């Protein structure tokens, strides 16, 4: 009886992290943390495998969902789709059900799987879509690895005195 209300706040932390992609616990009581001292995105956020509770499932997918959400709504600044996603999955967590606590483990795992697939689908549709990751990697190889020898010959002949 006491464990239900004692665990509800933990599930609220997980809810905020899963849906919007933000960290609430000011104290050290969660298996996801930040590093303000770090100066690169991929390593500001790190996981704590020792603190993963036994009653949580698909933790390694929760971490990726939250990290990709932060990346989308703070670096790519794609607020429109993030808001649409927030509404769509709040209509399942809080309207269809009564929160993460009021969800059987099977349905909770299924929900996290659906969120993971959707999030990575959109991340691909941006990074390898609008950004054209492959084209820019090809251009990196074209210029840094000397491929367009004509351009460099032009630079050297023009700058032979400078």
């Amino acid at each position: 009886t006491a464990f239900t209300e004692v665990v509800k706040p933990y599930y609220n932390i997980v809810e905020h992290w899963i849906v919007k992609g933000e960290l609430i616990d000011n104290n050290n009581e969660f298996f996801i943390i930040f590093d303000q001292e770090q100066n690169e995105f991929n390593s500001i956020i790190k996981l704590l495998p020792k603190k993963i509770p036994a009653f949580i499932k698909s933790s390694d997918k929760i971490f990726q969902i939250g990290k990709t959400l932060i990346f989308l709504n703070k670096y790519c600044r794609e607020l429109k789709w993030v808001n649409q996603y927030n509404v769509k999955y709040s209509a399942i967590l809080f309207n269809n059900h009564q929160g993460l606590a009021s969800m059987t483990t099977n349905e909770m795992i299924k929900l996290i799987d659906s969120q993971y697939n959707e999030i990575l689908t959109f991340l691909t549709q941006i990074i390898q879509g609008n950004n054209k990751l492959f084209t820019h990697v090809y251009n990196f190889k074209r210029f840094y690895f000397m491929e367009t020898n004509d351009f460099i010959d032009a630079i050297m002949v023009k700058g032979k005195d400078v």
Binding site: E22, L23, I24, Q36, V87, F94
Partner: protein, 100 residues
């Protein structure tokens, strides 16, 4: 030579706005998030990311000028270019021009 760029940009912006209606409709969902969004307290630890990112990368003047702030900034940069290119910004160049 500097004015050609502004002339082209302003013509592009005029053509862009000519075909654009006045007034835009904004829609929203029912927003059932409630406690899943309140995040009440002091604040979240996501404030660091806003400062970490930078927004000094804006170029290509795509589809013309889209914000009045850029509209003012373009002309301010143009005037600064006119003053700097002319022999009036340095002290050596201005002194030599005055003597000549």
């Amino acid at each position: 030579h500097n004015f050609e760029e502004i002339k082209n940009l302003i013509h592009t912006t005029a053509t862009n706005l000519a075909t654009s209606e006045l007034g835009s409709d904004i829609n929203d969902e029912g927003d059932n998030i409630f406690n899943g969004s309140l995040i009440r307290g002091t604040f979240n630890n996501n404030s660091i990311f806003d400062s970490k990112v930078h927004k000094h990368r804006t170029t290509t003047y795509v589809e013309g000028i889209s914000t009045v702030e850029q509209l003012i900034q373009k002309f301010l940069d143009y005037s600064s270019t006119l003053l700097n290119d002319s022999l009036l910004t340095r002290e050596e160049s201005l002194r030599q021009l005055r003597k000549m």
